[PDB]
Structure formats: structure tokens, C-alpha cells
Amino acid sequence: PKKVLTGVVVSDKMQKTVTVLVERQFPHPLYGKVIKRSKKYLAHDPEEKYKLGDVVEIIESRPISKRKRFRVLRLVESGRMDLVEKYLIRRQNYQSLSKRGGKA
Amino acid sequence: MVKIRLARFGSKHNPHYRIVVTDARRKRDGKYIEKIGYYDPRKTTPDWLKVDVERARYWLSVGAQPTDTARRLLRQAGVFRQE
Amino acid sequence: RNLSALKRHRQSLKRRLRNKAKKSAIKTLSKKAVQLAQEGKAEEALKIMRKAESLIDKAAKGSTLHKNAAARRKSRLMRKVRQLLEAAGAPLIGGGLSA
Amino acid sequence: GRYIGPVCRLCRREGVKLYLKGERCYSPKCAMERRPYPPGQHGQKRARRPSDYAVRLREKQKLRRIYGISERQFRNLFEEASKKKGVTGSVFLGLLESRLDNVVYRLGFAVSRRQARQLVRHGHITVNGRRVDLPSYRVRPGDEIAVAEKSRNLELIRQNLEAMKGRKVGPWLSLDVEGMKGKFLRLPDREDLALPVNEQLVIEFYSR
RNA sequence: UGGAGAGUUUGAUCCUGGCUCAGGGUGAACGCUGGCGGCGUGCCUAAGACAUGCAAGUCGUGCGGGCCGCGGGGUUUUACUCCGUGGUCAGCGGCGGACGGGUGAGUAACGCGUGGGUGACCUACCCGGAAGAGGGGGACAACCCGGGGAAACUCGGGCUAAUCCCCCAUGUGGACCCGCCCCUUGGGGUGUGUCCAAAGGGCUUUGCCCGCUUCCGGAUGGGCCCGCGUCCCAUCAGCUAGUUGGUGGGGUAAUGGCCCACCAAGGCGACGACGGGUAGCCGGUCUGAGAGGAUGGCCGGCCACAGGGGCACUGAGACACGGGCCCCACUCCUACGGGAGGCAGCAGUUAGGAAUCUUCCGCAAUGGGCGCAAGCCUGACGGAGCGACGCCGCUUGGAGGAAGAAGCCCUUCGGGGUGUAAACUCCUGAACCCGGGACGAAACCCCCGACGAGGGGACUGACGGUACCGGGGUAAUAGCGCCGGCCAACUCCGUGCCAGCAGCCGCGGUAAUACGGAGGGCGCGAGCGUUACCCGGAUUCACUGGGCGUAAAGGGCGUGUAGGCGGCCUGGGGCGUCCCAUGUGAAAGACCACGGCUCAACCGUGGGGGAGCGUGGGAUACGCUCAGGCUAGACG
Ligand SMILES: [K+]
Ligand SMILES: [K+]
Ligand SMILES: [K+]
Ligand SMILES: [K+]
Ligand SMILES: [K+]
Ligand SMILES: [K+]
Ligand SMILES: [K+]
Ligand SMILES: [K+]
Ligand SMILES: [K+]
Ligand SMILES: [K+]
Ligand SMILES: [K+]
Ligand SMILES: [K+]
Ligand SMILES: [K+]
Ligand SMILES: [K+]
Ligand SMILES: [K+]
Ligand SMILES: [K+]
Ligand SMILES: [K+]
Ligand SMILES: [K+]
Ligand SMILES: [Mg+2]
Ligand SMILES: [Mg+2]
Ligand SMILES: [Mg+2]
Ligand SMILES: [Mg+2]
Ligand SMILES: [Mg+2]
Ligand SMILES: [Mg+2]
Ligand SMILES: [Mg+2]
Ligand SMILES: [Mg+2]
Ligand SMILES: [Mg+2]
Ligand SMILES: [Mg+2]
Ligand SMILES: [Mg+2]
Ligand SMILES: [Mg+2]
Ligand SMILES: [Mg+2]
Ligand SMILES: [Mg+2]
Ligand SMILES: [Mg+2]
Ligand SMILES: [Mg+2]
Ligand SMILES: [Mg+2]
Ligand SMILES: [Mg+2]
Ligand SMILES: [Mg+2]
Ligand SMILES: [Mg+2]
Ligand SMILES: [Mg+2]
Ligand SMILES: [Mg+2]
Ligand SMILES: [Mg+2]
Ligand SMILES: [Mg+2]
Ligand SMILES: [Mg+2]
Ligand SMILES: [Mg+2]
Ligand SMILES: [Mg+2]
Ligand SMILES: [Mg+2]
Ligand SMILES: [Mg+2]
Ligand SMILES: [Mg+2]
Ligand SMILES: [Mg+2]
Ligand SMILES: [Mg+2]
Ligand SMILES: [Mg+2]
Ligand SMILES: [Mg+2]
Ligand SMILES: [Mg+2]
Ligand SMILES: [Mg+2]
Ligand SMILES: [Mg+2]
Ligand SMILES: [Mg+2]
Ligand SMILES: [Mg+2]
Ligand SMILES: [Mg+2]
Ligand SMILES: [Mg+2]
Ligand SMILES: [Mg+2]
Ligand SMILES: [Mg+2]
Ligand SMILES: [Mg+2]
Ligand SMILES: [Mg+2]
Ligand SMILES: [Mg+2]
Ligand SMILES: [Mg+2]
Ligand SMILES: [Mg+2]
Ligand SMILES: [Mg+2]
Ligand SMILES: [Mg+2]
Ligand SMILES: [Mg+2]
Ligand SMILES: [Mg+2]
Ligand SMILES: [Mg+2]
Ligand SMILES: [Mg+2]
Ligand SMILES: [Mg+2]
Ligand SMILES: [Mg+2]
Ligand SMILES: [Mg+2]
Ligand SMILES: [Mg+2]
Ligand SMILES: [Mg+2]
Ligand SMILES: [Mg+2]
Ligand SMILES: [Mg+2]
Ligand SMILES: [Mg+2]
Ligand SMILES: [Mg+2]
Ligand SMILES: [Mg+2]
Ligand SMILES: [Mg+2]
Ligand SMILES: [Mg+2]
Ligand SMILES: [Mg+2]
Ligand SMILES: [Mg+2]
Ligand SMILES: [Mg+2]
Ligand SMILES: [Mg+2]
Ligand SMILES: [Mg+2]
Ligand SMILES: [Mg+2]
Ligand SMILES: [Mg+2]
Ligand SMILES: [Mg+2]
Ligand SMILES: [Mg+2]
Ligand SMILES: [Mg+2]
Ligand SMILES: [Mg+2]
Ligand SMILES: [Mg+2]
Ligand SMILES: [Mg+2]
Ligand SMILES: [Mg+2]
Ligand SMILES: [Mg+2]
Ligand SMILES: [Zn+2]
């Protein structure tokens, strides 16, 4: 079956394309403890129909571009930046570990 | 085309083939599509030839082309015996 | 040395030529009809579009285009012509297009 | 290369008597009568308390020196026994006891196991009517071990099979002395055998 | 059904802790030794370089010719010219040359594995179904004539056949544009317009056969896409401009920045981007009680590559190992202009290396290509050869009998040992130019039948005179390591911190079971040792299964970011978790059973298990999430 994944829209800055952050949980192959892993997907959005905080269902689709093989199958629940913010902060976090660094 | 032939499986001087259904282009002892019999050229045992005739019939019904020796054995097990 | 199956190379060149030539015609006629269609000249734009259609299919009769390469061509051709005739066109000769 | 060397000297080193000559290892000459002590310039000196390893090693050497098998083949059998279902100790002794050359010895067709070995190699023996010249051939229950007709009239086979008249045979075997036939009734149980061997020590030796 | 530990820090002890050994393994190599056979296996280094031969052709039932030959015709005769037929040569044309065979360089990646997607696709030959093949026209080799080059090879001119190429027709049908309907990414139906078919050949020639055309489907094979999984370094922390997305176009069988034009300013990263190192991945293999570790030779699957780089042509299929073009490096021929090459195919040579084989036999069998067939090709394959390289089997004797050794070589000088051991008596009978002698091989073909089903029939074996059977018949290779402890086996002489041994602890300085020799002994035996490497023991990277006061180890202290973890009660959802059914989990291997070769190794048949993922159904205690509530934590 074409794959269906659920994630949060963390990016809307593209024409007809939104970035969907999908989370996945699973026991660690050797240490057992359940660990959360995740991947960002570039789903296709023809009508600019979705915005941030939107939890959608991504569906496996025929390639729309390089780096883009999924379409937004539907909205699960609207607005909720608790997730977007989370993502964003972790990103802002990076703005540190290097030669300089913020203060957070 | 897809064929029904023999695949060597015995040992040196101890041949034992498998009546097989594979693409004509594969190694002979290569990866077949389906085993449908087996043959012991030297009849070292009373069971030196078996052939899932129902299956042999299937493959032939869809284009399987038997080797001559393949056909010969299949016939010996009445794959064509319409009598 | 001397592998007589260089006759294949020998032959490929003759084929290469045959194909090569059929395509030029196709390309040249297509451009020609697309050019006329655009300039609004309808009756002749179609007339030629029609030749191109025929030539294309024939190209696919043997191993020049074959497959759905022919279909793409005719498709894109009948596409651009019908559209370019959106300059008050009115399919005069109603050649290949089925309005 | 089945050993081949002085034998009534292994018994001496092994403390116990290994009948590796059948005859003579009975007479007042098996040496175990006069010189039961190990061979060599130190055979009589005071003994030194053997090591756990020593005990296990000697015990393995005893059990294996009896059937006169190679350490290679001997080991092969033991491994096969560990793998089989059933108490390794016994199963192992069963397999050992199933070697044709051995069975030929149990039926009395020959004095010693060594002699019985040669009798197989030379085709004087027959399993189910077909010749079998492999001393290691594994006899199965029901198989009838015999003497090739052509060999039946051999001077040795006579004196030998004669000496077996009215003589007892292991419960898992059975021989018709006249026709010179014999049947392997079934695998002997630990109880059926009575060897100067604690096979448990052997299992341990191959556990190290 | 499964799990052993030992030596070594001290005067002694306990602990910590490293080193080391006992076990199993290897495509091995080296030393001493070496008899037979079966089955396996053998360039691990220079993807270095290669002489030579062979490794892909096949169709005369698609076509026309040349050379050589025989026969028969038209004449009164000759010349000239017509037909038939044989050998041979290539050419035109077709199918194959994209498979089969080699290798592991590159690659850390949708390459591989596993499970899925394609309404985004192709598939020669094969199979099933439907429909069809009317008419005309053209050219280029061969061949003929001439020109250029040293050669390779090449330029021009003329003639000609076809299942070669083209035109018109017929339109079962199919393709494209537009509309409509049903479906839902480009799936299917429908209407109008437009566009598109074909090749002939063979006869037991008046019907059969081989073949051709269009279409729908089957089968097999394949492209592309996606989830998850896939080594080391963070002494690599930021990376990116076709770079991320858009619109239009190009290109393909087809999706896609695959490519292009234009627009937007995005994309990726600590869940490790980018960079560096290393490496084909897998089924499996070795080891381990298991978890795990290590590995990927042989065999099967996938990928990649064909002297190094780039490229496309022809094709159903290639960007093509024995096709083509250009650049490079190198070898070769050269009349210096210019040409010819590519063993990572079999075998062989040379180089490198500790090290890896025959320039073998056969096409008989299995399999592949072409052919109507006969048959042709097939270094694929089936076999033999060489190498204890591995595994298995086997032999050097069996039964009876204690000379007894200048010297080897023990002693209490009484004796003890080698030892039933003994070219010495009886038995069997490995070897052995001695008789017979194989399965593997019955098809294609032919005839009858109806070229069907059936049924009869010529033919054909490399291995091989091999195996195996029967006869006769000789008593007929033994070596290597070790003997202080770990670790099975002790004495004499020699030597005197020397000569030397040594895995670790150590041994030798004049009584040495530790050096060398000898007798004796232990282990294993056509082998035995050594070196190297892998797993083990090592709970010594500890998930199973460890630690940090003084043994190595608490950060100098805090603050808090990400993250990890989260009190009590109820409800929803059902992600984690658990259960059921189902698909998948190739073969080989492994395990069990039975079976074939006298056994075994080896092999055949059958059986059982199986995690992971997909699908459908179900459960809700715990974890998660949403909602509500509490007050024992927290804070005020
Ligand atoms: K940054
Ligand atoms: K001429
Ligand atoms: K129409
Ligand atoms: K088809
Ligand atoms: K298909
Ligand atoms: K596919
Ligand atoms: K586009
Ligand atoms: K295992
Ligand atoms: K593995
Ligand atoms: K690996
Ligand atoms: K054929
Ligand atoms: K004989
Ligand atoms: K002798
Ligand atoms: K001295
Ligand atoms: K000594
Ligand atoms: K180790
Ligand atoms: K410190
Ligand atoms: K510090
Ligand atoms: Mg947007
Ligand atoms: Mg050809
Ligand atoms: Mg032009
Ligand atoms: Mg057992
Ligand atoms: Mg210590
Ligand atoms: Mg010490
Ligand atoms: Mg100390
Ligand atoms: Mg000390
Ligand atoms: Mg002290
Ligand atoms: Mg220790
Ligand atoms: Mg030698
Ligand atoms: Mg061999
Ligand atoms: Mg190599
Ligand atoms: Mg080389
Ligand atoms: Mg040849
Ligand atoms: Mg001719
Ligand atoms: Mg020819
Ligand atoms: Mg290949
Ligand atoms: Mg590689
Ligand atoms: Mg890298
Ligand atoms: Mg995948
Ligand atoms: Mg083709
Ligand atoms: Mg058809
Ligand atoms: Mg003509
Ligand atoms: Mg010419
Ligand atoms: Mg000309
Ligand atoms: Mg044609
Ligand atoms: Mg119609
Ligand atoms: Mg037409
Ligand atoms: Mg005809
Ligand atoms: Mg596009
Ligand atoms: Mg397209
Ligand atoms: Mg293509
Ligand atoms: Mg790009
Ligand atoms: Mg490499
Ligand atoms: Mg372990
Ligand atoms: Mg195991
Ligand atoms: Mg392989
Ligand atoms: Mg090379
Ligand atoms: Mg290249
Ligand atoms: Mg093409
Ligand atoms: Mg090629
Ligand atoms: Mg390639
Ligand atoms: Mg080549
Ligand atoms: Mg070679
Ligand atoms: Mg050298
Ligand atoms: Mg052949
Ligand atoms: Mg063939
Ligand atoms: Mg052996
Ligand atoms: Mg003596
Ligand atoms: Mg004797
Ligand atoms: Mg005699
Ligand atoms: Mg026969
Ligand atoms: Mg007939
Ligand atoms: Mg017949
Ligand atoms: Mg033939
Ligand atoms: Mg005899
Ligand atoms: Mg000892
Ligand atoms: Mg000295
Ligand atoms: Mg001394
Ligand atoms: Mg010494
Ligand atoms: Mg460990
Ligand atoms: Mg732990
Ligand atoms: Mg510790
Ligand atoms: Mg200290
Ligand atoms: Mg400390
Ligand atoms: Mg502190
Ligand atoms: Mg926090
Ligand atoms: Mg909680
Ligand atoms: Mg939480
Ligand atoms: Mg709840
Ligand atoms: Mg659930
Ligand atoms: Mg399952
Ligand atoms: Mg399997
Ligand atoms: Mg058997
Ligand atoms: Mg067996
Ligand atoms: Mg099996
Ligand atoms: Mg489920
Ligand atoms: Mg519930
Ligand atoms: Mg609940
Ligand atoms: Mg609450
Ligand atoms: Zn004795």
C-alpha cells in the first residue's frame, strides 16, 4: 500500500510545498529503551491548503520533484505550534555548538 | 522464452537433475522460477522420475517451452497422454 | 582478428542514416505547422500538421520512433497547433483536430 | 594408519587388561600377570598422584585403545553421539559397538578386534550377503553378518568358528555357528557391556 | 541438550588488573615427513603487462552473384547463348552478438537487504484470442570499370535481387486532439476529425508448413519510486546555487532540477549534515551457552566494472569485455604521412609475492544461439591432469612365540628397560603391462497414425578399457611434535650466565627431568609441527553482563538549553505493547527422517522450524496522547 505517515507542518515557505516532520517510536535494537526518531518530508500541496501547526497525513506518491515524493492526504488537526516551536528551538539550538554560540 | 528444462544437482558422476521452469537466459543451475519434477538418469532408486504433471500442464498452457529431453521425460509421465 | 560480425557495425550506419533522416523531416514539418498555426494561418497549418502526423506514425512503423514516442509527438503537436490557433483561428480545414 | 605397534604394553600403561589379542591375553603370558606395571625405565618407580586431566585422559585412552580406532574416528563418533538424542555416554558406546569389525569380534568370527579388522579388509566377511570390506561400516539391527562362502573353508575361520561351538554370545547378538551366520539384534545397552571404563570421565575429557 | 578454567605482582594474604595458555576455524603459507582412493578446492599480491591457440555464431526453406567443376539444350558446324547441378567465397538480408563466462577496481549509495508503490512504464523470441496481407515504385553491396595509400584501408563511376526501402489502398483494430460518461494522479468506455498495417518462402504445391501485419491478453524479464536497516573518525560542525521549490518546455518506455528558460528563496544538519578513512551488499560462513563478535573464498541472488576518461550509434533490450568514435598512458608496424592493439574468457607466459594448477580430453550428457530439418557453433559445461590445500574412507599386517645387540644405552652391579617387540616358525593377501566390463542414452530423426495422443525404429560415450565382477597373488611406507609448571610423558652424559631454550611464569654461573645428544616415555599419525589471521576463554566496552572513598574512574562549583525521566483518580483515542488470521521469508546451507555410492565424505527425496516487514481483525493493564479532577511532589 502506498505509505501513509502523520506529521506536523514545520515549513510553509515553499510554493505548493510544505515540510512535514514525522515522528517514529521504537525499542532500541540492543538497549531496549523506546527511543523517538524522526524525519522531515517534503509533501506536495497544490492549493497552498496547509499551514504551520497543521497535523497532516502524508501519502506515498508518484515523484513530484527531486526530493519530493509525497502528497498531503489530509489534515488531522489544525494549529498547534507546540510542535513547530519544539522543532524550531532544537534548530535554534544548533545556532551554538561550533566556534561561537548563542546563550540559550 | 520461458522454458522447462533440466538443472544439474547431483555430484561428479552422480547426476540428479531438477525438472525446472526458468527463463531461457538464466544459468542452467541458476535461479529457476519453479521446480516441477526431478530426474535420476541412472535410476539409482525406484523413484528416479517424478513430475507435477498438473503444474507441467500449467506452464505449457502459458508458453513454457520444454527442452527435447525435458519434453521426453514429461511425456513419460503422461503430461501429454490424452488417451 | 576479423570478426565478420562487424557487418553489424556496417549495417548500423545505414540504419542510423535512415532514422536520422526520418526525424529531420518530422521535426521540420512540425516546426512548420506550429509556425503557421501561430501566425494564424489555419487551413495550411493544419494541412502540414496532418503530414507531420502521418510521418510520425510511419516513423514508428519500424524502429525509428516506435513505442509511445510517436504518441507524445502527435500529442504535443496537436496540442500546440490547436492552441496557437487561439488568435481567431477557427479550424478551417478541420484537418487532424476533431473539434 | 591404525596404530600398529606393540600391544600388550598399552594394557600395562592402562593399568587394566585390554584384550587386544583375544587368545594369550588369557594365558599366564599377557604380561599383566608378570609386569602389570606401565612400560619403560620408570614403569616400576613410585607413582605420583595423577591430575584430574590425567585421569580423564587415560580413561579416554583406555576406551579408545580397546576398539583400536584412531583418535580422529573415535572423536567423530563421540561428536555424533553428543548430537544424537539420548544419554551421550551410552549412545557413544553403542555406536562404537556397531562397527562391523567390532561385531565380527563379538560373534567370535575372530579372536581379536585387530584380527577381525583384517577379516573385513580382506572381504572374508559379508553383511546381508553382500561383501563389506570397511572395518568402520556401521551395522544396524537386523543385519546378518556372515562369512563369505569362499572364506568358510579357511583354516583360520574353522579353528575360530569351531571354538565357538556351544559358546555364549552377547544378548544383543546371535549366531548360528554351523551356517556361520550372525544377527545384530539391537544396540547394546550400557548394561549389556562391561568395560573397565567410566565413560562419564570421557565425556568430561571432551568438555575441557 | 545449554555455560569447566589455568599460569603470572607478595615473605605470605585478599582484591584490582593486564599479559599468557588450554578449544574451534582459515582459498593458507613455511619446516621435517609422505603410500592408495572418492569428493571438494587452488593469484588472498600488480583492476600490473601480455606471445600463441581457442573462447559467437547460424540460416541456400529470405536474395542475387563471383571463382572452380560436371551434365543437358538452340546450329549443318564454330562462335555465341539457354537450363540443370556440385564445391567454394564473401556479399545483401535475418535472428543471435545485451545471454552464457571473468573480476571486485569503483561505490557508505535506494548499491544492497526487507517490505511495498507504478493512475508514471517497457518487454525480442513463447502462449491464447480477434482481424488481415490489393496495387505500384526505389536504392545499395556483391559484380564490373577507374583513382589514391607503404600498410590499414580508401575515393569515384556503372549494373542488380529480396522477407531491403518507400508510395497508394483496405482499418479488425490502434495512436493523437476536443467533448461526454464511468472511474479516480496518465485507469476504462464513447462520439466526431485526423493518422497508421503487411513478406514472402517451402513443399508429400492446390492444401499443408515455416514466416509476415495490426490489436487485446498471458507468461517471463526489466526500469523507475518509497518506509525501515547497512563500518570508523567530531582532533570533520556547519553544508548547499541546479542548491530547495514553482510555472513552462525539453528528453524518456516512464516519474523526476533528469536537463533548459523564467520566477521564488529556499533545502540539509548534533536523531551527526559537510568532510576524511575504509569497503561491493546479501543468502550465508566461522566462533559463541546465548546475546554477540568476526567474516562474505567456493556455490546461489543482486550491483559494478572490461587499460584510464568521456560519448553516442544500432537495437525489444547496450551506452555494449571478444561493436563504434575522441582524449590519455603504453606495446607494435611505418616508405614518418600514418596505421594496429586491450586475456578482470579457457589454457599459458612474465612481474610482484610466503603462495595458488594443464598452452589437457570431449560436445557423449545438461544448458544456450541459429535452422523446417539434417545439423553447425558453444574453453558454458561434462570429464581427466597437477598440489596431503580440505573432508571422508583405506594400507604398511593377523594369530603364536621373551637373545638380549663391538656399540646405543640404566644400575644399589643383585638387576632394571626397549618387550611379544624382533629380516627367525603358521594365516590372510595392499600392491601387481593377467579374464570380463558399465550405468550415465534416449530423445531430435524416420515410418504407422492426423507432422496430435499413442506406437515401433537406424544413430550417438569424452570420461575408459575407468568403475565394478570373477581369477591368480607378494608380508608389503612411518613419520612429526613434545616430556620444569600451566600440560599426558624422566633418567644418563655433555656443556658450565657459555652454547643455547623460551607462549607466559622462567631455565643455563659444575649434580640442569627446562640447553644439545642418547635410552626411555606421552600425544597424534600420511601426517605432525610453525607462522599469520578470526571467534573463544575475556562479565577484559559488561544488552544479556562491569564499574568510579583509598585499586583506573565524580566534572572545581553552580545556572540552566536541548534531551532523558514523571504523583493520585476518571474518560476518550489505541502510537508504543500484546494476541489471532494471512501474505512474504527462492534455491543452496543448517536441523530431523529415509534413501543412492560396499561405508563415509558426497549426494537424493521428504519433513519441521523461523525473526523482520505487509494486510485484516482484536485487547487496553502499563507507557504515550487528548480531556477532566485531586493535593501527598513543587512553588506561593
Ligand atoms: K547555523
Ligand atoms: K556490369
Ligand atoms: K474515428
Ligand atoms: K503482449
Ligand atoms: K508484467
Ligand atoms: K517491477
Ligand atoms: K517541470
Ligand atoms: K552456528
Ligand atoms: K552477518
Ligand atoms: K559485512
Ligand atoms: K527453434
Ligand atoms: K580382484
Ligand atoms: K613384515
Ligand atoms: K661435568
Ligand atoms: K633432559
Ligand atoms: K581473542
Ligand atoms: K580531578
Ligand atoms: K575544567
Ligand atoms: Mg506556501
Ligand atoms: Mg550474419
Ligand atoms: Mg531543416
Ligand atoms: Mg547425546
Ligand atoms: Mg598476577
Ligand atoms: Mg613472576
Ligand atoms: Mg606491588
Ligand atoms: Mg615471588
Ligand atoms: Mg608486605
Ligand atoms: Mg588474572
Ligand atoms: Mg618434499
Ligand atoms: Mg582431485
Ligand atoms: Mg584477483
Ligand atoms: Mg595478473
Ligand atoms: Mg573451439
Ligand atoms: Mg555459387
Ligand atoms: Mg554466404
Ligand atoms: Mg555477467
Ligand atoms: Mg569492489
Ligand atoms: Mg565517504
Ligand atoms: Mg528499498
Ligand atoms: Mg533484435
Ligand atoms: Mg500470437
Ligand atoms: Mg520490384
Ligand atoms: Mg560501388
Ligand atoms: Mg554508384
Ligand atoms: Mg519491412
Ligand atoms: Mg471499429
Ligand atoms: Mg495507408
Ligand atoms: Mg506459398
Ligand atoms: Mg515536466
Ligand atoms: Mg512527459
Ligand atoms: Mg532506449
Ligand atoms: Mg540536479
Ligand atoms: Mg576496494
Ligand atoms: Mg561470550
Ligand atoms: Mg552454534
Ligand atoms: Mg558467489
Ligand atoms: Mg589489465
Ligand atoms: Mg572505459
Ligand atoms: Mg533506438
Ligand atoms: Mg558487445
Ligand atoms: Mg556497461
Ligand atoms: Mg577479451
Ligand atoms: Mg587466462
Ligand atoms: Mg618471485
Ligand atoms: Mg553439447
Ligand atoms: Mg543441445
Ligand atoms: Mg585421512
Ligand atoms: Mg634384550
Ligand atoms: Mg605380531
Ligand atoms: Mg599363501
Ligand atoms: Mg539405457
Ligand atoms: Mg502420415
Ligand atoms: Mg514417440
Ligand atoms: Mg544429436
Ligand atoms: Mg583368493
Ligand atoms: Mg606431567
Ligand atoms: Mg660452548
Ligand atoms: Mg649435568
Ligand atoms: Mg634434553
Ligand atoms: Mg565479551
Ligand atoms: Mg550493564
Ligand atoms: Mg571492572
Ligand atoms: Mg594513588
Ligand atoms: Mg584514584
Ligand atoms: Mg566534587
Ligand atoms: Mg526540560
Ligand atoms: Mg505517569
Ligand atoms: Mg513527556
Ligand atoms: Mg488514557
Ligand atoms: Mg496500536
Ligand atoms: Mg509471519
Ligand atoms: Mg531456504
Ligand atoms: Mg546408505
Ligand atoms: Mg548415508
Ligand atoms: Mg533438503
Ligand atoms: Mg496488524
Ligand atoms: Mg478501549
Ligand atoms: Mg483508555
Ligand atoms: Mg490533568
Ligand atoms: Zn593384553
Helix (H), strand (E), coil (C) string for chain D:
CCCCCCCCCHHHHHCCCCCCCCCCCCCCCCCCCCCCCCCCCCCCCCCCCCCHHHHHHHHHHHHHHHCCCCHHHHHHHHHHHHHCCCCHHHHHHHHHCCEHHHHHHHCCCCCCHHHHHHHHHCCCEEECCEECCCCCCECCCCCEEEECHHHHCCHHHHHHHHCCCCCCCCCCEEEECCCCEEEECCCCCHHHCCCCCCHHHHHHHCCC
CA of D138 to the centre of ligand 31 (A): 45
Cα B73 to chain centroid distance, Å, stands at: 7
What is the Cα–Cα distance from D92 to D203, expressed in whole angstroms? 10
Neighbours of B43 (CB within 10 A): 10
D21 touches strand E (CB under 7 A): yes
The CATH number of residue C77's host domain is 1.20.58.110
D196 touches strand E (CB under 7 A): no
> Which residue has cell 544419554?
D87
DSSP type of residue A76: E
- The residues spanned by each domain of chain B are 1-83
Number of structural domains in chain C: 1
Contact between D205 and D138 under an 8 Å Cβ cutoff? The reply is: no
Q: CA C14 – C1' E158 distance (Å)? A: 21
What is the Cα–Cα distance from D135 to D143, expressed in whole angstroms? 15
What is the Cα–Cα distance from A40 to A42, expressed in whole angstroms? 7
Neighbours of D146 (CB within 10 A): 24
Neighbours of C81 (CB within 10 A): 26
What is the Cα–Cα distance from D20 to D26, expressed in whole angstroms? 11
Neighbours of chain A (3+ CB pairs under 8 A): none
Element (H, E) at A96: none
Please give the grid coordinates belonging to residue D190.
Answer: 550400557
Residues 35-54/B with CB < 7 A to strand E: 38, 40-45, 50
D108 touches strand E (CB under 7 A): no
Output helix, strand, coil percentages for chain C, rounded to the nearest 5: 65, 0, 35
Which residues, 6+ apart, have CB-to-CB distance to D150 below 8 Å? none
What is the Cα–Cα distance from D20 to D136, expressed in whole angstroms? 17
Contact between A36 and A25 under an 8 Å Cβ cutoff? The reply is: yes
Query: Alpha helix (H) ranges present in A34-77?
Result: none
What is the Cα–Cα distance from D97 to D126, expressed in whole angstroms? 17
What is the Cα–Cα distance from D31 to D21, expressed in whole angstroms? 12
Q: CA C15 – C1' E331 distance (Å)? A: 36
Nearest CA to C78 among D110, D17, C48? C48
Q: Look up the domain containing C97 and give its range.
A: 1-99
Contact between D164 and D108 under an 8 Å Cβ cutoff? The reply is: yes
Q: Using the CA of D24, which nucleotide's C1' is the nearest one?
A: E400
CA of B6 to the centre of ligand 60 (A): 29
How many Cα neighbours within 13 Å face the side chain of A3?
9
Please give the grid coordinates belonging to residue A68.
Answer: 519530493
B27 touches strand E (CB under 7 A): yes
DSSP type of residue C64: S
Residues 57-86/D with CB < 7 A to strand E: 57-58, 61, 70-73, 76, 82-84
- Residue-by-residue DSSP string for chain B: -EEEEEEE-S-TT---EEEEEEETTS-SSS--SEEEEEE-TT--SS--EEE-HHHHHHHHHTT-EE-HHHHHHHHHTTSS---
Sign, CA torsion B20/B26/B31/B33: negative
Element (H, E) at A35: strand A32-44
> What b/e readout covers C27-43, taking b as 16+ CB neighbours within 10 angstroms?
eebbebbbebbbeebbe
Name the residue with the least CA to C1' distance from nucleotide E185.
A62
Please give the grid coordinates belonging to residue B3.
Answer: 522454458
Residues 1-60/C with CB < 7 A to strand E: 1, 3-16, 18-20, 50, 53-54, 56-58
> Hey, is C15 helix, strand or coil?
helix
How many Cα neighbours within 13 Å face the side chain of A34?
4
Q: To what resolution in angstroms was this structure determined?
A: 2.9
Nearest CA to D137 among D154, D150, D119? D119
- The residues spanned by each domain of chain A are 1-104
Q: CA A35 – C1' E279 distance (Å)? A: 30
C-alpha distances out from residue D19 to D62, D63, D105, D195, Å: 11, 12, 11, 11
The CATH number of A1-104 is: 2.40.50.140
The β-bridge partners of A75 are A56
DSSP type of residue A29: T
Q: Which domains does chain D have, with CATH numbers?
A: 1-96+194-208 (1.10.1050.10), 97-193 (3.10.290.10)
CA of D79 to the centre of ligand 55 (A): 14
The CATH number of B1-83 is: 3.30.1320.10
Element (H, E) at A58: strand A55-65
